[PDB]
Amino acid sequence: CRLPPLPTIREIIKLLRLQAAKQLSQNFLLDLRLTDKIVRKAGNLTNAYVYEVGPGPGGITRSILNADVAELLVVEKDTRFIPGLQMLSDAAPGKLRIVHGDVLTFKVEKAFSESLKRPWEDDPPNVHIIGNLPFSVSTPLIIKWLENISCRDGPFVYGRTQMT
């Protein structure tokens, strides 16, 4: 797959219409080797439904796409990155579903098909979650998803979904 080039920091600064490098208020992992490492540690994703959060520039997104994922659902809150994610989607037809929304409220139990929903006592249900979010958002999210596991609802309606 011929994916478009990864944005540089100058291109990111222009994209946020910020015109400077000091007021980013955000840190980007623009090194594809570390993102490749992270996706490797996420497990074998060949033909796996991956729900990715906090894409931003899209290093994790490109790394996941390079793995033979079946469908990749992406949720982005900043609309300014949606153009880049859209070009990335055009590069990979039918393997990227972008959604503009907030991960603390987005409802994943309806995103993927119902044929995926495996029992709790069987193996994890081929659905993986990967995320590099702001640290101010990852802890409410993990608390919320722990509550979901305790209730066996939300992303864990499919079974014992693994998170990275």
Binding site: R2, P4, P5, T8, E11
Partner: protein, 398 residues
């Protein structure tokens, strides 16, 4: 010798001679006078509104002549041989003389403005002719990715847009000069620091990406390799560009001995594959202008160049149309399409009463000075040569 009088005849495929006149024969690759897109000319004039007085005319003339008459940097070994000869016949002073002092051009803001004003239209014309070659001969080609090494002002980007804008989606422009990159951005934004780009998908980089994994449909280098300080630098750059070439590698230089020598070195480098196990195993051939992959028959003493006429950007000094004399080589991945390859006219065709002088680079690797006449060569072939021009192809077989 690709014209044996009484034996060679015109090549009639697709029912040529019956279904279309002689002026439109398939080797006609002449491009009408090139006029720049109005946005580019407007942007250039707006960017030069600050200072375009009598001093600028002198600066442009000086820079153009300096670039035209610049020689390749002399390699160590040639200096060593010359030093030995002079010693056999103080030596250092005699070497300061009779040797070209090659210097790096540091393109600051002022010199970038001068270079833009001096070379934008000429480079656009040359690159447009080189691209028209591919468009005319393979009209089914729809590139999606283009890289341009030494993207000075974006003339390559603008020409590629003007030709393949309905398919191109990524224009990678590499240039170590921050001033040149800023100027290219301004020109793309209509000559204003704030605006919307005229061409979408243009990426600007200060360093050349070195990786065989990423591969572009068209890789271009126009008047760029002559800026590199040494043959080793030229070699490594050409190797990288070929590795990242997907379909076509287009090298364009001045129409001088230096430019032609540079391009022939690059052609030999690409044609003689050294890499043991490259990621892309496809072989390379010369799409244009050479009808063969044999050594240039004309590199011994002369050069080889082609002319494209164009209308310069309006200025206080640009009144009449100009000619851009350039050397080109296009290297394509794969193998030649067929075996019916045609000679290339590498020199102005001289029309004289009942005969035509044409200098041809034949598929066998030799130059032929042919004086075509009706009685000797056939009426149809004579008419084809009569209507042909410099840089075209002559459709002859056996």
């Amino acid at each position: 010798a690709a014209l044996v009088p009484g034996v060679t005849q015109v090549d009639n495929k697709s029912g040529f001679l019956q279904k279309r006149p002689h002026r439109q024969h398939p080797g006609i690759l002449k491009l009408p006078h090139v006029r720049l897109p109005q946005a580019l000319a407007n942007g250039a004039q707006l960017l030069l509104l600050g200072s375009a007085g009598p001093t600028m005319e002198n600066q442009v003339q000086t820079l153009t002549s300096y670039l035209w008459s610049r020689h390749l940097p002399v390699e160590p070994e040639e200096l060593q041989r010359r030093a030995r000869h002079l010693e056999k016949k103080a030596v250092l002073h005699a070497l300061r003389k009779t040797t070209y002092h090659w210097q790096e051009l540091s393109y600051t803001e002022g010199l970038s403005l001068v270079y833009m004003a001096a070379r934008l239209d000429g480079g656009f014309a040359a690159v447009s002719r080189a691209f028209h070659e591919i468009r005319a001969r393979n009209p089914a080609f729809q590139p999606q990715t283009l890289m341009d090494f030494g993207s000075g002002t974006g003339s390559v980007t603008w020409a590629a847009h003007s030709i393949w804008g309905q398919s191109l989606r990524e224009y990678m422009c590499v240039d170590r000069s921050a001033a040149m990159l800023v100027l290219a951005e301004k020109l793309l934004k209509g000559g204003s620091e704030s605006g919307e780009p005229y061409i979408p998908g243009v990426f600007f980089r200060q360093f050349l990406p070195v990786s065989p994994k990423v591969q572009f449909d068209v890789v271009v280098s126009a008047f760029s390799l002559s800026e590199l300080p040494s043959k080793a630098d030229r070699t490594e750059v050409v190797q990288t560009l070929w590795r990242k070439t997907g379909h076509f590698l287009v090298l364009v230089e001045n129409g001088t001995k230096a430019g032609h020598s540079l391009l022939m070195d690059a052609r030999d480098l690409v044609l003689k594959g050294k890499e043991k196990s490259p990621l892309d195993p496809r072989p390379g051939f010369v799409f244009a202008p050479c009808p063969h992959e044999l050594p240039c028959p004309q590199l011994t003493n002369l050069a080889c160049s082609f002319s494209q006429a164009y209308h310069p950007i309006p200025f206080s000094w640009n009144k009449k149309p100009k000619e851009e004399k350039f050397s080109m080589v296009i290297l394509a991945r794969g193998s030649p399409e067929e075996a019916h390859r045609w000679p290339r006219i590498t020199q102005p065709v001289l029309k004289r009463p009942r005969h035509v002088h044409c200098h041809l680079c034949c598929p066998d690797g030799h130059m032929q000075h042919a004086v075509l006449t009706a009685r000797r060569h056939g009426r149809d072939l004579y008419r084809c040569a009569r209507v042909s021009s410099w840089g075209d192809l002559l459709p002859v077989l056996t």
